[model samples]
Target: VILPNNDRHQITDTTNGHYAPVTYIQVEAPTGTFIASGVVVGKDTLLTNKHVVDATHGDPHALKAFPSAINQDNYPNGGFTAEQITKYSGEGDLAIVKFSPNEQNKHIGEVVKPATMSNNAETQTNQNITVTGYPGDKPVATMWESKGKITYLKGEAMQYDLSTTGGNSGSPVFNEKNEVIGIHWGGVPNEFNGAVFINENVRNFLKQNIEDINFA
Candidate 1:
């Protein structure tokens, strides 16, 4: 099983604008179906875990992103099937998915905003961070948030005490300023959670790809 059945704290009562940058992603792999999350870095652009996309068994187009605040009761919008893999780093465990908002009434701006990337100094231990996403095992499948402080820096990953699950693989780790500092990918639940740091490599990728994305 994927990291054992897990849980998280709900973030918003409704799909408000503040947390809309987090997108619920669905992946269909040869192994099985899985739920994941992603952070909107640009209009129609999302950054997530490469494994989430890789699980599609080589079909990058098999991934779909739902910007609506989905739950057991509602899914306000249709899914945006991934059109391309703009950039990916299996070594870093991160990937960027591009989409075309061709579906009627499914504009990127109305669904979500691009997250503010953190330009802070290199991450250090004991720094505060928050993560938001949709946990797969939750009964309602709504967006959830978890807060914690970095325990240590494990190479390209930030080790923290945030509560998360398999569904959170591509969730963004936000700093106190509400800027994205890393991408949460793994952890052992009660022990702690791990996120891929938004270091130079990721920053460079966003810079090079952000402007080319066509949200219209």
Candidate 2:
């Protein structure tokens, strides 16, 4: 949801380049089991259900790949091949997918810099939390939508009720003022009745561990 105004959706089909910056990673083999959901966090790294990787258990090497969007028919266009796996946690249900970095295949948005972090209190409780991603897409059409007050939160794992779906995992949850507060890691189907929050665990991970992640 990197729109200029922070609408958290892809209204227009013409998304310049990685237009709807945030993405939901779905890992699938050539013609086998496929598990989906979760959002991409840093660079090509994404957080998703561990079961998605379980299906490929014990294989010395898995031909892992993620669909570029929620569109099933997107075929070759909506998927990227994985070059190397930096980290993974089966028990935690988290996997980090690192793609080969090349000029042709760059990331979508600017890394959420310290300066870009929002501090708008207006987006606090009862305010609108923006959710963005391609929830559903097929060969004929791809669907992206946005709404306000999707849900609210309070304590750790601060939950919400946004209209989220399969292709929203790892999608960063933004407060009303468009500052990222948590990430979309849980919830079921299209209920949008429940949303999970990214608490201190994630915050601590980035602040302590990722500061050393080289970009060059």
Best by lDDT: 1
RMSD of 2: 6.8
User: Which stretches of model 2 miss by more than 4 angstroms?
Assistant: 1-10, 13-19, 30-44, 47-79, 83-95, 102-123, 137-143, 150-155, 188-192, 212-216
Q: What lDDT tens digits, residue by residue, belong to model 1 across residues 123-184? A: 68988777888876675558887767788785566787767766878888887777888888
- lDDT per residue for candidate 2 within 19-124, as digits (tens), equals 2334434444556644344444455544444444454453413523332343444432344445544333212334444444334564422322111233323435
lDDT of each: 0.72, 0.43
